[PDB]
Paper text:
Ibrutinib, an irreversible BTK kinase inhibitor, has been extensively studied in the B-Cell related malignances due to the effective roles for interruption of the B-Cell Receptor (BCR) mediated signaling pathways. Recently Ibrutinib has also been reported to be effective against [name] mutant Non-Small Cell Lung Cancer (NSCLC) and now being tested in phase I/II clinical trial. Given the fact that both [name] and BTK kinase bear a similarly accessible cysteine residue (Cys481 in BTK and Cys797 in [name]) in the hinge binding area, we first tried to determine if ibrutinib binds irreversibly to [name] mutant as it binds to BTK kinase. In summary, Ibrutinib inhibits mutant [name] kinase through formation a covalent bond with Cys797, as other irreversible inhibitors, but due to an unusual DFG-in/c-Helix-out binding conformation, this irreversible binding is much less efficient than other irreversible [name] inhibitors such as WZ4002.
Covalent binding of ibrutinib to [name] Cys797 was confirmed in this structure, and we found that Ibrutinib binds [name] [name] in inactive conformation, although this protein by itself crystallizes in active conformation. Four [name] [name] protein molecules were observed in the asymmetric unit of the [name]+Ibrutinib structure, each binding to an ibrutinib molecule. Interestingly, despite the same covalent bonds formed between the Cys797 of [name] and acrylamide of ibrutinib, the four ibrutinib molecules adopt two slightly different conformations in the piperidine-acrylamide moiety. The Met790 side-chain well fits to the inhibitor and make beneficial hydrophobic interaction with the phenyl ring attached to pyrazolopyrimidine. This may explain the relative tolerance of ibrutinib to the drug-resistant [name]-bearing [name] mutants comparing to the first generation inhibitor Gefitinib. Ibrutinib forces [name] kinase to adopt a distinct DFG-in/C-helix-out inactive conformation. The bulky o-bridged biphenyl moiety of ibrutinib can be accommodated by [name] in the inactive state only, while WZ4002 can bind to [name] in active state and probably also in inactive state. Two major differences were revealed in the superimposition First, the beneficial interaction between Met790 side-chain and the phenyl ring attached to the pyrazolopyrimidine moiety of ibrutinib does not present in the HKI-272 bound [name] [name] structure. The terminal phenyl thus makes direct hydrophobic interaction with Phe856. This interaction is not observed with ibrutinib since its terminal phenyl ring does not go deeply enough in the ATP binding pocket.
Author numbering: 700 to 749, 754 to 862, 875 to 1017
Amino acid sequence: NQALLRILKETEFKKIKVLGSGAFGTVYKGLWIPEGEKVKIPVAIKELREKANKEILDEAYVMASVDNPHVCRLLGICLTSTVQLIMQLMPFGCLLDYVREHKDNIGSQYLLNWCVQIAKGMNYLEDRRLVHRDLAARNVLVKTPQHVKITDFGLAKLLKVPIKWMALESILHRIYTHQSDVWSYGVTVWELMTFGSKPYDGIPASEISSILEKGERLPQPPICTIDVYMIMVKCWMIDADSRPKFRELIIEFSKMARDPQRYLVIQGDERMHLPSPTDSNFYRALMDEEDMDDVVDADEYL
Ligand SMILES: */C=C\C(=O)N1CCC[C@@H](n2nc(-c3ccc(Oc4ccccc4)cc3)c3c(N)ncnc32)C1
């Protein structure tokens, strides 16, 4: 579906501010102004650091074809000897920055729900027989605090390797599968549960395969019950086929979401809440009108 990707002229948009800079590229806050109109519409622009345009376009069409509440869809592209990718601007930013900023005051309901949502997005990709190759907290965007979407799908294929998120088989032989995606998902969950901690920090990348072969793993976060830690451990099993499936993960986390205090131990959690319906309705109307499955709420509390 070529209609899904908009080809943008340089004249119809402008980069206004740098939001972040990456090995993959630089991300800018931008404005689209549509031809013949007086409106300036905020957009996010990713300019890749630096394959012919035909190959790039062909990859781009697939990237534009992902349509799920929990995956970000590439909206537009401009090809000018630099590759510029256009998507919605998300004021909330990446999940990783968000958890660090809120590290004191994030509730168990949010964390479990984020786990469900990410799994839902990954599952959609698996169902489509597509592999992300770079799942990480940095690569999840926050639409609203209640709603998160996986981003940068297909970028890894298109283009400093994230060794510390990679499955052993990926590090060793660069084999990427839904099962390697599951491994990355586990690291991502660990990031959330540690409020933005950097996995294997201080361990050189060159040693990572060896420690994994030894069987060393990321440690259990203090907030996590063993039940949650075991799910991460299952994600990092050497035999890829043994690892959990995204469809299973959606169910497990959803179950946990029903009695959060059973599975995550957080100080003052009783004080921290998912939004009331009134608040949720307000957020959706203002900035999140797309259809999504309702957040899983505690059985006790509704
Ligand atoms: C934790 C991530 C981080 O540090 N960032 C730096 C600041 C910007 C932030 N960010 N990135 C995007 C973003 C992501 C992807 C794309 O383009 C795509 C889309 C789909 C597939 C491949 C490439 C563009 C922009 C942000 C957006 N969209 N809004 C707000 N912050 C974004 C990452």
